[PDB]
């Protein structure tokens, strides 16, 4: 199948996300073993960012690590599995509010462009704005 890291490197729309993963040095982590629920922003999510905010995020190594670490859940959580509003400890420390409506999963009041994609070490949900 592949870890989270390679379902990511295999879609040519997470380009920014991976480099950013490398830069934060979160490659091994998402390529080693474990159980993570990854909400992955598409290039567009990053592309959507306003300039001063684009620079604060990406022009600062501590920024990214912090934010990138926040899109990464502690447990594995697919759609079927959301029976109530679920809170996921992000590897950053703060919670990710997950929930479900019309088969569309949501995270911090933002719709997932594509619910849960598997990987040998977690699952990823595609979204189009950074959390």
UniProtKB/Swiss-Prot annotation:
Changing residue 43 to S: Found in lattice corneal dystrophy; unclassified form; late-onset. Plays a role in cell adhesion. May play a role in cell-collagen interactions. It is linked to Corneal dystrophy, epithelial basement membrane: A bilateral anterior corneal dystrophy characterized by grayish epithelial fingerprint lines, geographic map-like lines, and dots (or microcysts) on slit-lamp examination. Pathologic studies show abnormal, redundant basement membrane and intraepithelial lacunae filled with cellular debris. Corneal dystrophy, Groenouw type 1: A rare form of stromal corneal dystrophy characterized by multiple small deposits in the superficial central corneal stroma, and progressive visual impairment. It is found in: Secreted; Secreted, Extracellular space, Extracellular matrix. Induction: By TGF-beta. Highly expressed in the corneal epithelium. Expressed in heart, placenta, lung, liver, skeletal muscle, kidney and pancreas. The gene is TGFBI. It comes from Homo sapiens (Human). Binds to type I, II, and IV collagens. Gamma-carboxylation is controversial. Gamma-carboxyglutamated; gamma-carboxyglutamate residues are formed by vitamin K dependent carboxylation; these residues may be required for binding to calcium. According to a more recent report, does not contain vitamin K-dependent gamma-carboxyglutamate residues. The EMI domain contains 2 expected intradomain disulfide bridges (Cys-49-Cys85 and Cys-84-Cys-97) and one unusual interdomain disulfide bridge to the second FAS1 domain (Cys-74-Cys-339). This arrangement violates the predicted disulfide bridge pattern of an EMI domain. Residues 1-131 form the FAS1 domain. The chain holds residues 502 to 632 of 683 of the full protein. Changing residue 54 to W: In CDGG1; common mutation in Europe and United States; rare in Japan. This is Transforming growth factor-beta-induced protein ig-h3. Changing residue 121 to H: In asymmetric lattice corneal dystrophy. Changing residue 130 to D: Found in lattice corneal dystrophy; unclassified form. Changing residue 54 to Q: In CDTB; originally thought to cause CDRB.
